[PDB]
From a paper:
Type VII collagen is an extracellular matrix protein, which is important for skin stability. The structure of the vWFA2 subdomain of type VII collagen has been determined, and it has been shown that vWFA2 interacts with integrins.
In addition, a new interaction site for laminin‐332 was identified and characterized. These data provide new insights into vWFA2 functions in the extracellular matrix.
Numbering used by the authors: 1052 to 1205, 1208 to 1238
The structure:
């Protein structure tokens, strides 16, 4: 069935060296959603440093080729910063809210969190409010992240996946999340 998915990525000059690995991850996750279309899957994207950067809304395009180029051209230019909290809030207010561009009513909304560093500041309040508004929150913790942080948010439990390494550990986590996304519709 139809689904509105918005991915949240940590993107700075500090983790620019992992951009290609993350791109391949996102490609698999976008594939997991099935055909893109106004009556099918939609994808939005926001990145975060200390500040949030919405890159494109759910209805920016249904052309898979264009969407993947946008992902390819994600700016990794910002200074150091890992403010996931404000990112969640911004993605909610401007990309997944009922009034957001391309957001479809009676369609499940999903917020997918990519994390690769220990989290600073409050994430509990933004995530809880996203859940309360009816959004499904999922998180992929990449190598470098603290795997316990997004597991101890007690708000409803999150579907968490942790890459214990950048190899098979990563592959398993991504596959598990891909299955989880397929079921979210
Ligand atoms: O350039 C094209 O031929 C088609 N565009 C549209 C998609 C792409 O460039 O990937
Ligand atoms: Mg083209
Ligand atoms: Mg950083």
């Amino acid at each position: 069935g139809p689904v509105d998915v918005v991915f949240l990525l940590h993107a700075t000059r500090d983790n620019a060296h992992n951009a290609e690995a993350v791109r391949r991850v996102l490609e698999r996750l976008v594939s997991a959603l099935g055909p893109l279309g106004p009556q099918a899957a939609q994808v939005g994207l926001l990145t975060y440093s200390h500040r949030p950067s919405p890159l494109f809304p759910l209805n920016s395009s249904h052309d898979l080729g264009i969407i993947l180029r946008k992902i390819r051209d994600i700016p990794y230019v910002d200074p150091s910063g890992n403010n996931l909290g404000t990112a969640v809030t911004t993605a909610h207010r401007y990309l997944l809210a009922s009034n957001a561009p391309g957001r479809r009513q009676q369609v499940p909304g999903v917020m997918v969190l990519l994390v690769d560093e220990p989290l600073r500041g409050d994430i509990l309040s933004p995530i809880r409010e996203a859940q309360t508004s009816g959004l499904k929150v999922m998180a992929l913790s990449l190598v470098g992240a603290d795997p316990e942080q997004l597991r101890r948010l007690a708000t409803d439990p999150i579907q968490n996946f942790f890459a214990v390494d950048n190899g098979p550990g990563l592959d398993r986590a991504v596959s598990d999340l891909a299955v989880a996304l397929c079921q979210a519709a």
